[PDB]
Ligand binder design. Structure first.
Ligand SMILES: C[C@H](CCC(=O)O)[C@H]1CC[C@H]2[C@@H]3CC[C@@H]4C[C@H](O)CC[C@]4(C)[C@H]3C[C@H](O)[C@]12C
Ligand SMILES: C[C@H](CCC(=O)O)[C@H]1CC[C@H]2[C@@H]3CC[C@@H]4C[C@H](O)CC[C@]4(C)[C@H]3C[C@H](O)[C@]12C
Length: 159
């Protein structure tokens, strides 16, 4: 079955620029700015569109070694990006997949809001509780603030 967890968080970066830097070029940018959270991102197959597979590796000592993401949909107009965690780490006999959706919306102050939905597809009577998905949110937040810090400091990047 499916457990749906939704959150929002704010960014000080405008939606289009954040979408281009953090989501689209996130494969280059995230390991450079947050190497203590993400050790590398390997493109396995594809050019970034639906069906593209990436292997996200975590630093030594983390609970999980890696996950593989599959890009599902990329909407450049509405700054929506949908991807699934389909292998690795927690994926196995208790968790089949995680289907994720990020949408970035402009705020009139020149920042953005990130709307996130994470759907945990389980196998068995295995439960996913808000407490534990908190680590997903903490990760996301750390990555976001690392990207924002970079973008604030490198004004000519991703315009
Ligand atoms: C795999 C987790 C957890 C999501 C969940 O619990 O469902 C998510 C949380 C934040 C995600 C990252 C956001 C920044 C990057 C976005 C890129 O387009 C793909 C690589 C990165 C580095 C992502 C890798 C991976 O997709 C992460 C680490
Ligand atoms: C808490 C859920 C659900 C696990 C389950 O079904 O039992 C699991 C599923 C995906 C997991 C994430 C995968 C990517 C990351 C791996 C890191 O090495 C630890 C932090 C992250 C951000 C993990 C946090 C947490 O461990 C999650 C969100």
């Amino acid at each position: 079955g499916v457990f749906n967890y939704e959150t929002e968080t704010t960014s000080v970066i405008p939606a289009a620029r954040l979408f281009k830097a953090f989501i689209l070029d996130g494969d280059n940018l995230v390991p450079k700015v947050a190497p203590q959270a993400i050790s590398s991102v390997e493109n396995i197959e594809g050019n970034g569109g639906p069906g593209t597979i990436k292997k996200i590796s975590f630093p030594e000592g983390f609970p999980f070694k890696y996950v593989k993401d599959r890009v599902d949909e990329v909407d450049h107009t509405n700054f929506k990006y949908n991807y699934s965690v389909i292998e690795g780490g927690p994926i196995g006999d208790t968790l089949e997949k995680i289907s994720n959706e990020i949408k970035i919306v402009a705020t009139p102050d020149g920042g953005s809001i990130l709307k996130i939905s994470n759907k945990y597809h389980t196998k068995g009577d295995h439960e996913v509780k808000a407490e534990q998905v908190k680590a997903s949110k903490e990760m996301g937040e750390t990555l976001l603030r690392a990207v924002e810090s970079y973008l604030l400091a490198h004004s000519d990047a991703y315009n």
